[model samples]
Target chain A: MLGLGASDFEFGVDPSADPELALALRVSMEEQRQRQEEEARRAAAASAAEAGIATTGTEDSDDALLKMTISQQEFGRTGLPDLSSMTEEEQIAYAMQMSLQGAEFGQAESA
Target chain B: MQIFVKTLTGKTITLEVEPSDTIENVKAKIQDKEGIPPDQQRLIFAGKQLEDGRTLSDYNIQKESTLHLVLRLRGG
Candidate 1:
């Protein structure tokens, strides 16, 4: 049968069934996850790049510009957050969170 | 002494750069300071692409100078 990989892992497994099915399913799901993560990373990188252009910090002389707070002295210095302050998992989470936030900011600035 | 940068997505940023700084060097500094990727960055001045490796003085950037950096999104 051409069952899709989405079938629940609890599919009928006879005591004599080959282990190939289990391995196939696991590998397929891992590949799916890897693809998703890669896309997310790419999106984040693009977003961060845009964010960099959206903020000029103190270089700007327009004191009344709306939408963002840019002080070249301050914004120029504000790069990725201090990773040392976060644990391993926390670092990843923080980076992802910042990416999302950068994406949001980029969107707003672009708009 | 200053230049403005607008990204591909219409985002604008301003930078104060010296006349002696080459666009190539400026780009690296921007990436280092602002975290923009090298491949996705462009130093635009008055709707024109500054010649690669050109210095700030080679262009007409001023205190209210405007430039741009366009970032193209790439997905896996």
Candidate 2:
């Protein structure tokens, strides 16, 4: 078993001159954009309901949508080139990384 | 260059490294300081695994960048 957790690092000052940094930033940019799209698309319920990655009714709750996209582990049927060759260990490391750092409005609140 | 390595045990170890150092070299330095074996150590940056034959630069691991350690906890 393996585990990981950290912030998504898009802290580049500029990456236009460097292909690696540019590529890295592209992924982060695309990642955040999807989060936005999902939040926005929640306006439509049937898509969430008809798609049916949820277990219960067409309830379209956050828990249902969140569970489906997360389980997909490959851009949530949104868009991205194939990263399918990574082994099981690599997948877990990727999934667990950024430990709760992506959502714009999903941060935990403390009392 | 200074590299930060985060261990699975929730400790951060800072190491002085050269940009030319290979992933294997980093593993050796880590084992020396932490008593972990080189073969038992797996390093990652973001989600990318650091292969032993590769240099730090291969993964764009510049100064102050953090590497995650997935310890095997067994030599065999």
Candidate 3:
């Protein structure tokens, strides 16, 4: 079950830009991404490693929205884009807003 | 009438109110208790937006009727 609680990604400073902050933030993001990527990698490798392997696990119900929301926040906060001049918090806000507007808002291309 | 509020974060709150209260009154009470502003309160009772000035009784909200409240964080 997808338990409910306060999200840790609650509008934190994204993509910390300072060398020290960037390094720390990058490390954490990499760690977060590693979980999903590693899972996929291991699944593929295991399929190859075993003959006639039966995979029971399905990656259908991924927490992609939550993860992407957080990653974009990190990216903007880190000042990765050339136009990024705002504070880390602002960048995070921008990223979250962008995600919501792009995917969650009712503005579908169709009626 | 009693109003039940359910947030996306799994928070549920209910309030007992008189039928003569306006939608604005409900919004005020919600904001006071939940810290959610009126604009942020997306209230739906009987599948409609309760008109701002209309009284609950005018909208056919009986003393025993229950209203549902859903909160969504829209701003980035």
Candidate 4:
């Protein structure tokens, strides 16, 4: 489960655009991307993993929707493309665009 | 009537309310249970914001229906 607690971070003037700082930022960005991809993969796996569980038609029957909604919220907070504002067709196109990007991501991981 | 409220962190809170219960009242219950202020919540049903002044029956919210609870983002 994700934490609802607050977090702290730092921001400052660029260190004279130093090559080292640029390299560090690139590395940091790559690491964050990898972590997010891993999280997505795990969530997908878990969603599929629960297929065997029988639905009892109780409050728990909505568990799948709750999980997806939470995942959507978490992804939304990450400054991703906002589907809420997009029309259905536009959203599908945007999703296809992201699907192409995912292909690139797969290639990147394999390489 | 019983309605299901699904939060952003995979928490589902089942609420029992009258058909005449206004959306605002539901928000109050959510605030009590989820620590989210009523004004800070955006309850979406059937692809629209459920108006506070409207009753659950007005929105046709029946038993076993699910409502998505999203926090209203504020500030920069």
Among these predictions, the greatest TM-score belongs to 2
Residue B4 in candidate 3, Cα distance off native in Å: 2.4
TM-scores of all predicted structures = 0.35, 0.44, 0.36, 0.41
Fraction of native A-B contacts kept, per candidate: 0.00, 0.03, 0.00, 0.00
Model 2 alpha-carbon drift over 4 Å, by segment: A1-96, A99-111, B73-76
Candidate 3 residue-wise lDDT, A8-97, digit = tens: 443234422223233333444554688889998888877775874556876644688778876786464643554445577667667756
Q: For residues B1-76, could you state the per-residue lDDT of candidate 3 as single tens digits?
A: 5766554333567877887888888888989987878865655564455676887878777655545554434342
RMSD of 2: 16.5
DockQ of each: 0.01, 0.10, 0.01, 0.02
**Residue B58 lDDT, candidate 1, scale 0-100:** 85
Look at candidate 2 and tell me the lDDT of residue B49: 66
Candidate 2 C-alpha error for residue B38, in Å: 0.5
Q: Name the top lDDT candidate.
A: 2
lDDT scores in order: 0.59, 0.68, 0.61, 0.65
Q: lDDT at B64 for candidate 3?
A: 51
lDDT of 1 by residue, A25-98 (tens): 44446646888999998888888876754765656546545324544433455466765545786677777666
lDDT of 2 by residue, B1-76 (tens): 9888876555878989988899999999999999988987778775666779888988878887667777543223
Alpha-carbon DockQ of candidate 3: 0.01
Residue pairs with colliding backbones in model 2 are: none
Which structure is stronger by DockQ: 3 or 4?
4
Which parts of model 4 have CA positions greater than 4 angstroms off? A1-111
Ranking by DockQ: 2, 4, 1, 3
